[PDB]
Structure formats: C-alpha cells, structure tokens
Amino acid sequence: GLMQFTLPVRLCKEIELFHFDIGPFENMWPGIFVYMVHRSCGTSCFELEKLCRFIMSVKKNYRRVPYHNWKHAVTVAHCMYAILQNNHTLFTDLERKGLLIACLCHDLDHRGFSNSYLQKFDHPLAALYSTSTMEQHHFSQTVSILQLEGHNIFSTLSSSEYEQVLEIIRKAIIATDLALYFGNRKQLEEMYQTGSLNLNNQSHRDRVIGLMMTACDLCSVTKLWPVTKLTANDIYAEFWAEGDEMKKLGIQPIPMMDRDKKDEVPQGQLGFYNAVAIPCYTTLTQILPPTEPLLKACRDNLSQWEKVIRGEE
Ligand SMILES: Cc1c(C(F)(F)F)nc2ccc(CCc3nc(-c4ccccc4)cn3C)nn12
Numbered sequence: 613g614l615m616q617f618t619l620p621v622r623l624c625k626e627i628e629l630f631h632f633d634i635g636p637f638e639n640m641w642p643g644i645f646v647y648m649v650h651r652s653c654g655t656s657c658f659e660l661e662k663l664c665r666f667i668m669s670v671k672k673n674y675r676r677v678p679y680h681n682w683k684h685a686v687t688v689a690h691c692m693y694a695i696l697q698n699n700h701t702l703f704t705d706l707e708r709k710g711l712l713i714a715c716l717c718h719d720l721d722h723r724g725f726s727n728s729y730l731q732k733f734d735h736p737l738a739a740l741y742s743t744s745t746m747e748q749h750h751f752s753q754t755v756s757i758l759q760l761e762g763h764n765i766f767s768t769l770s771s772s773e774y775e776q777v778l779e780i781i782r783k784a785i786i787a788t789d790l791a792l793y794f795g796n797r798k799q800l801e802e803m804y805q806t807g808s809l810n811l812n813n814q815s816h817r818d819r820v821i822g823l824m825m826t827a828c829d830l831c832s833v834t835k836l837w838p839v840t841k842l843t844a845n846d847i848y849a850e851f852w853a854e855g856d857e858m859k860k861l862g863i864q865p866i867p868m869m870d871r872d873k874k875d876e877v878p879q880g881q882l883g884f885y886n887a888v889a890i891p892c893y894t895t896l897t898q899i900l901p902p903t904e905p906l907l908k909a910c911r912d913n914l915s916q917w918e919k920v921i922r923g924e925e
C-alpha cells in the first residue's frame with residue numbers, strides 16, 4: 613500500500629511524453645504498466661498481487677508475431693496513459709481503470725492475420741463472429757483471463773460498476789477494428805462542427821473513447837522517426853506473411869500485403885497518413901486540445917516519408 617513503483621530518471625520524465633518508446637527490455641514492461649496505472653488511476657485502483665498476476669497472464673496470451681505482440685499492447689496502453697494524464701478532469705474513475713486494461717488487452721491472442729484473411733481461410737472465429745472477428749475474440753480472451761482464480765482486478769467494484777467497466781472495455785476493444793474508425797471519425801467531425809458534441813451524452817463519450825482507441829492503436833506513427841521507421845518493418849512483415857497465405861489459397865493479395873511490391877511502401881505510407889492517421893489525430897486534437905503533440909508528431913513522420921520518396925533517404 614506504501615509500495616510505489618519508481619522508474620529510472622530518464623524513463624520517469626520521458627514516460628509522460630506522447631512519443632515515449634518503452635524500450636527493448638521486455639522485463640521492464642510490466643513495471644512500466646503498473647507505474648502508469650498507479651499515476652493515472654491511483655495505488656488503490658487494483659490489488660497489486662491480482663494486477664501483477666493479470667498482467668502476466670495477458671503477456672502469456674500474446675503470441676510471438678512481428679508486430680501484434682506484447683510490446684504493441686504496452687505501447688498502446690502508454691499512449692492511452694499520456695492522453696488520460698493530459699486530460700485529467702475529463703474522465704470518470706471507471707474510465708481511467710477500464711481504458712488502460714482495454715489497451716493492454718486490445719489484441720490478446722492475435723495471430724498476425726486480418727479479419728479478411730480469417731474470412732477467406734474460413735477460420736472458425738469467422739463463423740463465431742461475422743464482424744470485427746479478431747476484436748470480438750480479443751474481448752472474449754479478456755473476460756477469460758479476468759475469470760481465472762486470483763485474476764479479478766475488478767473484485768472491489770459493485771455488480772453494476774463491474775458491468776459498466778466491462779462495457780467500456782468491450783466498446784474500447786471493438787473500436788480498434790479500423791473498418792469502424794472511418795464512420796466513427798465522420799460522425800465525431802460532424803458533431804464537433806455543428807456544435808452538437810456533448811460529453812454528458814454516453815453515446816458521444818463512446819464515440820470519443822472509440823477515437824482515443826484508434827489514436828492509441830496507430831501511435832507508432834507518432835514516435836521519433838527511427839522508431840516509426842523500424843516499427844513499419846514489423847508491420848509489413850506481418851502483412852507480407854498474410855499475402856503469402858492469400859497466394860496459398862489462390863488469391864492475389866492487395867499490394868499492401870504483396871512483398872513483390874515492397875518498392876511502393878513509401879507511397880503506401882503517404883496514403884495511410886493522409887487517409888487514416890492525420891484525420892484521426894486532427895479530429896482527436898479538435899475534441900481534446902492537449903493531444904496536439906500526437907498530430908504534430910504524425911505530421912513530422914508524414915514529412916519524413918515524403919523525404920523517402922524524393923530519394924533524400
Ligand atoms: C504504419 C502503420 C500503422 C500504425 F499506425 F499502426 F503504425 N498501421 C498501419 C496499417 C497499414 C499500413 C500500410 C499502409 C499501406 N501500405 C500500402 C502499400 C505498401 C507497399 C506496396 C503497395 C501498397 C498501402 N497502404 C494503405 N501502415 N500502418
């Protein structure tokens with residue numbers, strides 16, 4: 613109870629910034645996550661013993677794939693931590709508890725394959741869940757782990773508070789299905805511009821948390837250029853493996869997933885920053901002004917991919 617987690621000085625200062633990289637020392641990531649829960653939520657939010665046991669079972673249920681791995685989960689949780697810490701008074705106690713857990717869990721038991729590949733393969737998960745296939749799986753894996761003995765980190769919440777936090781987590785994880793993001797951002801755009809956006813309207817909060825989830829999930833475009841650039845290799849190593857698997861089913865993959873078309877990566881990144889990332893952090897900055905460093909960092913990285921195309925790197 614008087615037992616704080618404390619980080620070395622450079623991490624203690626830099627973890628508060630949006631562009632923080634959690635580093636290559638896997639064994640420090642649990643400690644980084646508890647640090648973040650303690651400062652964004654309180655030392656009283658979770659029993660330390662239960663939280664530590666939950667974090668280690670979550671780690672165990674992330675697979676050894678190039679991108680959608682344990683490092684991604686903790687990276688997405690740190691972005692969320694930075695958003696919550698720069699918007700102190702906008703969020704409920706339940707939201708602060710739910711959203712870091714949501715982020716840590718959002719890609720549980722990912723296999724490095726998209727919803728479309730599961731559908732074309734005719735994976736069982738595609739019959740159990742006809743839309744947001746992997747996302748419904750991730751939430752189902754989260755509930756599983758919460759129900760193992762000694763793993764109920766929400767044990768002190770009431771019956772109705774428990775149901776509310778699990779409902780924040782469910783919508784938060786569903787929102788990481790990027791197919792849902794485009795309509796969610798348009799509605800948020802229209803609502804903000806016509807002045808109807810109302811943070812007391814629960815259906816409006818939901819949308820705003822959805823957009824936070826997209827922003828955290830895409831936060832590898834908001835890092836320093838060398839972090840952004842090396843993560844992109846991990847991202848494409850998954851997509852190219854999926855493309856190989858499409859070719860094995862007798863389907864020409866899209867170019868994004870076809871390793872034979874590596875050369876078009878720079879222009880594919882441009883499209884992605886313009887079509888997805890920039891509009892994401894733009895609408896996010898409109899709704900939550902203190903998240904502007906994410907938009908500024910995203911723009912700097914677009915500018916770096918423009919330099920790659922111009923043969924200046
Ligand atoms: C960085 C990043 C992130 C984030 F935010 F998580 F880092 N998420 C994603 C999701 C997708 C992509 C790939 C973006 C993309 N490449 C192509 C392409 C590439 C080579 C040849 C032909 C076409 C098309 N298109 C849309 N990057 N990405």
Ligand SMILES: [Mg+2]
Binds near residue numbers: 718719788789
């Ligand atoms: Mg996902």
Ligand SMILES: [Zn+2]
Binds near residue numbers: 829
């Ligand atoms: Zn993710």
